[PDB]
UniProtKB/Swiss-Prot annotation:
Oligomer and partners: May form homohexamers. Interacts with N protein.
Catalytic activity, reaction form: Thiol-dependent hydrolysis of ester, thioester, amide, peptide and isopeptide bonds formed by the C-terminal Gly of ubiquitin (a 76-residue protein attached to proteins as an intracellular targeting signal)
Membrane topology: Multi-pass membrane protein
Stated regulation of activity: Inhibited in vitro by GRL-0617.
Compartment(s): Host endoplasmic reticulum membrane
Species this protein is from: Severe acute respiratory syndrome coronavirus 2
Protein function: Responsible for the cleavages located at the N-terminus of the replicase polyprotein. Participates together with nsp4 in the assembly of virally-induced cytoplasmic double-membrane vesicles necessary for viral replication. Antagonizes innate immune induction of type I interferon by blocking the phosphorylation, dimerization and subsequent nuclear translocation of host IRF3. Also prevents host NF-kappa-B signaling. In addition, PL-PRO possesses a deubiquitinating/deISGylating activity and processes both 'Lys-48'- and 'Lys-63'-linked polyubiquitin chains from cellular substrates.
Name the UniProt record assigns to this protein: Papain-like protease nsp3
Amino acid sequence: VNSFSGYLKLTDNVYIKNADIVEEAKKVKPTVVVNAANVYLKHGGGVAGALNKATNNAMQVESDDYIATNGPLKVGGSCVLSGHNLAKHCLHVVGPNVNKGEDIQLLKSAYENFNQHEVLLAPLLSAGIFGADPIHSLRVCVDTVRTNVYLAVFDKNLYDKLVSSFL
Ligand SMILES: OC[C@@H](Cc1ccccn1)Nc1ncnc2[nH]ccc12
Ligand SMILES: [Cl-]
């Protein structure tokens, strides 16, 4: 039993809700919140920009030190950093950004990072400003993640479409 509330159950381990991941994380304070990161951990917009804003830019400061030490992530890769005031940890995961021409096949590799954590609050990878089809992202999530994932979809219209079209 966990403290996530109001989710629709899609499979044994995947749940979905219309919610602002920022407000969800603040309410639940999960062990792991997933960020929709880019390889430079520049949290300018989308989910990343919103999560960073909620940390008063502390996420960006920590991320800049991470990059200065380690260099950029790989597309499909991840790193674990602090969750600041939002969660214990933030798993920064880089899905492919279609608006950069990146290979959509890497979306499965991106979701594989979730399997290293027993429970996660997450957005749909490569959705929104990363330009992938959210219906496809949900399918890859369900077919790749085996740990317990609580998906937050900010857009109510998109949420209803994701639920109604789910196979
Ligand atoms: O896929 C992730 C995208 C989905 C999206 C957003 C808007 C319009 C269309 N798609 N973004 C988010 N998801 C959950 N919480 C969020 N908080 C801020 C941004 C955000
Ligand atoms: Cl977005």
